[PDB]
Amino acid sequence: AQANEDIVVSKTSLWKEMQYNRDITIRFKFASSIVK
Amino acid sequence: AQANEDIVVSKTSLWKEMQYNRDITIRFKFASSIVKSGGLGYKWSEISFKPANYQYTYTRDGEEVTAHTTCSVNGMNDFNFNGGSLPTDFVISRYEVIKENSYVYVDYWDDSQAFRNMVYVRSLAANLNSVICTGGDYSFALPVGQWPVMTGGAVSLHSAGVTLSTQFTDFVSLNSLRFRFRLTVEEPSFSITRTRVSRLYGLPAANPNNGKEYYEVAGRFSLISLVPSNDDYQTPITNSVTVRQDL
Amino acid sequence: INLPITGSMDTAYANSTQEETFLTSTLCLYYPTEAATEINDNSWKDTLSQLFLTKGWPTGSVYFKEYTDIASFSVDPQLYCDYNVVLMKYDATLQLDMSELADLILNEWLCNPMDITLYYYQQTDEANKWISMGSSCTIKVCPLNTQTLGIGCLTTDTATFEEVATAEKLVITDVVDGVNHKLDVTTATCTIRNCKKLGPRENVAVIQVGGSDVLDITADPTTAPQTERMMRINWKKWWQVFYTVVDYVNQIIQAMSKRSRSLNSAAFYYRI
Amino acid sequence: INLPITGSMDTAYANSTQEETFLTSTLCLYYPTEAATEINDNSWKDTLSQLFLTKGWPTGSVYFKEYTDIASFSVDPQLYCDYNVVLMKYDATLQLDMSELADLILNEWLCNPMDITLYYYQQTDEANKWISMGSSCTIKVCPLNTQTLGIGCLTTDTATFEEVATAEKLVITDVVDGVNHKLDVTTATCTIRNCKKLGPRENVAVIQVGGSDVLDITADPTTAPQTERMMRINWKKWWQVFYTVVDYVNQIIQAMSKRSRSLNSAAFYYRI
Amino acid sequence: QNYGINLPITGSMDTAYANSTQEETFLTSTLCLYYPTEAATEINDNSWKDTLSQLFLTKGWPTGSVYFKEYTDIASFSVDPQLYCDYNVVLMKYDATLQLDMSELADLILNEWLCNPMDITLYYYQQTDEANKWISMGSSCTIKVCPLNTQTLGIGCLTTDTATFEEVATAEKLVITDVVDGVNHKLDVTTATCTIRNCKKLGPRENVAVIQVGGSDVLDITADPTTAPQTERMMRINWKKWWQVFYTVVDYVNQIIQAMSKRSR
Ligand SMILES: *[C@@H]1O[C@H](CO)[C@@H](O)[C@H](O)[C@H]1NC(C)=O
Ligand SMILES: *[C@@H]1O[C@H](CO)[C@@H](O)[C@H](O)[C@H]1NC(C)=O
Ligand SMILES: *[C@@H]1O[C@H](CO)[C@@H](O)[C@H](O)[C@H]1NC(C)=O
Ligand SMILES: [Ca+2]
Ligand SMILES: [Ca+2]
Ligand SMILES: [Ca+2]
Ligand SMILES: [Ca+2]
Ligand SMILES: [Ca+2]
Ligand SMILES: [Ca+2]
Ligand SMILES: [Ca+2]
Ligand SMILES: [Ca+2]
Ligand SMILES: [Ca+2]
């Protein structure tokens, strides 16, 4: 089992149920609003 | 094949892949934002673009089709002209111009069957014709003295890639078709009269329409979307927005 | 008639139906203005009728119909007679035009109309073509792909279309059969019709008055045939032309044969 | 192979080899710069490829090769494909030139070089001709009697010679067979070769886009033939010509047949 | 006299050994040497061709049957070689900086290729079998290739940005390119100066004979790195002069032309 897999837990004529298990690095940031 | 075909390339019980191949008349329009700094009136703060909506109703081959278009610009260049530090010299802190490195986006939407429940699209492609966007004449209304006029500017819009987008507005939200346009600078240049600036290509962001009601360009688009088999389903269009309450 | 016919090789050859088909049939010539101009006579029609009277055609059976030019005749021709002869002047600057005229009158066409705005058409077989008539026809075509967009052309920008005709009175157009074409036509001045080429028209007879045989009826390049009713003459006057036609009118009408399809005064049948 | 072949008449007609020869063969058009000019499009090659694709010819099998002039093409024509089509304009002032071109590409030649200064050559049969290529050939020849003297010419005075070409890019020279000729050629710009005409090249198909049939492939003034891979169109545009060639390419390839002799890119074999 | 057809030929084993065709194939055939400019330079004579032909005369090759055709260098000869004679010999110098050049030359002349044309701008090509290659000639060829995937997109390269392409050739006069068989490749080539042709290798050309004048056997004709053959018409020599080389070629021309057999085509 990989770290960034991609599986198909079902499949119909057009749609499909896929499973995704993936690692991420959330590089977020705040921002302030000053009012004088 | 008709010019406004609608074909089915696959159909399961509830869903169906419907192909659409249709002609369109994109009538769009720029819109400019003019912010003038305080003091006497000799300094302008910004002359920039604002995404501009325009809804119209045109005639198809024996049908009346209502539409909704939204023009925007990306990657514009920010020029400026400052002739003095005193309150009586005409200065423009930042004004926008369009050149090759910029792009012109146009979101398009109709009341037709193609855009009724469109959330998924593949095999997207379009044949668009090229047009020429010419700027107008904006008279900087100074308090006293002379009246410089930013006049001129021509630039040719050529067809480019196509994508999807979402037109958000205070009334309707539309899952729409995004046509891109690239720019090739034309011969008519824009120049601020009674000033030391002239013979510079591009389009000015003060009066791009040139007193026109819109810019017209005809096209054709071809896609394949997912539509429920039952031709009675409806996706929410209208809105009631209360965003930016802090603002 | 679906039924068959039977016969035998022992029966006898009947008498000549000539000298009766003349009486109970009409003949019509199509001459250019140039002929009457070079002639400068006002009774040449009655003269030629009195001459035909010796060959057997009675007085009120021959007719003459002027046409100022090959193209002005090509603009919606109307052959309404029982035996038509056409005299056609040769000019290398008009070769394809006076071959299209041949392809139109010598053959028998079944034509449907065409609505370019609402529809995009295509040719099924090697006998379907698009024939367009009017005062100035400028025809451009953009072939299309599986998804109804352009191939080396833009479905809207008519400059990117491919020009197959430039201010032509009669155009016969064949395109790649099996693909859909979007058309641009001077519909104000020209009508275009999707026409199928049926069996030939044995009622008419073209006579090229000048140069060597060039008419290629068949749009395919391999055949280049020469039918029996496609004649040639070498000329320096027009009175000699008409005297030759009158002297050898029996051979011409033996090379021609009355029609079987229907009664029709146009150069093409209409079936909507 | 020298052995014989045997067969029957009960054996059955196998399926159509068309729709597989298209996949396993190549097609190559030779068009004039006039056509590219009148078209004024930079995607018509891809257009025609996508069109042919419906006729069965796959993408990477169709090729187009621009040739600016009939004479420039006549200068060592290099055909290396399995099915060659040539579109040839008509000009009275170039009649013999575009006839020699046909005579050269339609037929298969076996060529030895010629050393004018050191040796003196003759023709043996009615198929041993002297073909000269180059940018400007001006050829002169002196026939010689039994005792190696001149006849109406002198072995030294190049002005007494008999001129047969005047700055011609391709010439095919047939002289009396049985007598030795002393030649004078602009060897700096032209090469001349003693060639023998073999059986025909069935890989090429000439298409005279314009006027009446003029090509006399055979040098003798008695046959004046018209082979099967030698067509004639009447034209006013070029897109119509190309659409026609496409719609009727199957008849063209049925009129052509892949070669038997060997693999070669030139229009003639070399055997020293 | 049936052409284009292949039929079974019969034979036996009690038939007698017919007379020698040598001393008649010489009279009814022509020979052609391809010598480098270095040799004439070292010689410094204007009658050596006549001398060699008068010598050949003793071996049976008459005056107007032998020919000499000069070439300045291996690559200048690699540019569109026209070997049009009944017997062809090619003297070839050895230089480690030109091993691939004089292997490609051998691969090109010793073997009989069936060459179809190519149009890079429109079409994207692939090699079907182990005998389909792309031979490019000209004065300066610079070839770059991008493999493509099932959906007509790149593999370690961008269909638009030519720089991303993988360079297999850099200013070569003759290149024989073999790429992976089964994947459509998009190409960029200096078509202004070079012409490229999709060529299938048929059976060999028995009408030519390469003679390597210097170093050991290096020519890897077969693209597959498993055979590494050495045919009968791939000869080798050691040299300190060129007159000795030409005398040797003359004195042993009979074995050379016994190793060479006239073409089938
Ligand atoms: C046909 O011609 C012959 C010879 O003139 C004549 O005797 C005969 O009566 C003709 N037939 C009829 C039905 O009159
Ligand atoms: C030959 O043609 C017939 C008729 O189309 C077809 O039924 C048959 O399968 C074909 N056989 C081969 C071997 O192509
Ligand atoms: C073949 O060689 C033998 C021995 O030299 C000779 O006697 C015979 O005549 C030769 N054959 C022919 C056809 O000359
Ligand atoms: Ca016409
Ligand atoms: Ca076009
Ligand atoms: Ca057709
Ligand atoms: Ca000539
Ligand atoms: Ca003389
Ligand atoms: Ca002769
Ligand atoms: Ca090399
Ligand atoms: Ca890369
Ligand atoms: Ca390979």
Residue numbers in the entry:
A (entry chain 1): 248 to 283
B (entry chain 2): 248 to 494
C (entry chain i), D (entry chain g): 55 to 326
E (entry chain k): 51 to 315
Excerpt from the publication:
Two relatively heterogeneous classes showed membrane-engaged reversed spikes, with apparently variable angles of spike contact (classification #3). A further classification step then yielded two maps from 56,593 and 70,018 subparticles (classes 5 and 6), respectively, with relatively well-defined lipid-bilayer density (classification #4). Even within these classes, variability of curvature at positions at which the bilayer bent away from the particle blurred the membrane profile around the circumference of the contact. Local resolution estimates for classes 5 and 6 showed a well-resolved, virion-bound VP5* β-barrel trimer with its central coiled-coil domain and a poorly resolved lipid bilayer. We have now shown, by analysis of individual spike positions on cryo-EM images of virions attached to liposomes, that VP5* trimers, in reversed conformation, interact with the lipid bilayer, recapitulating the interaction inferred from icosahedral averaging of much lower resolution cryo-ET images.
Rotaviruses infect cells by delivering into the cytosol a transcriptionally active inner capsid particle (a "double-layer particle": DLP). VP4, activated by proteolytic cleavage into VP8* and VP5*, is the principal membrane-interacting partner; VP7, held together by Ca2+ ions at its trimer interfaces, is a Ca2+-sensitive “clamp” that anchors VP4 onto the underlying DLP. Accompanying or following the engulfment step is a large-scale conformational rearrangement of the projecting VP4 trimer (cleaved to VP8* and VP5*) from an asymmetric, “upright” conformation to a threefold symmetric, “reversed” conformation. A major consequence of the reversal is projection outward of the ~250 amino-acid residue “foot” segment of the VP5* polypeptide chain.
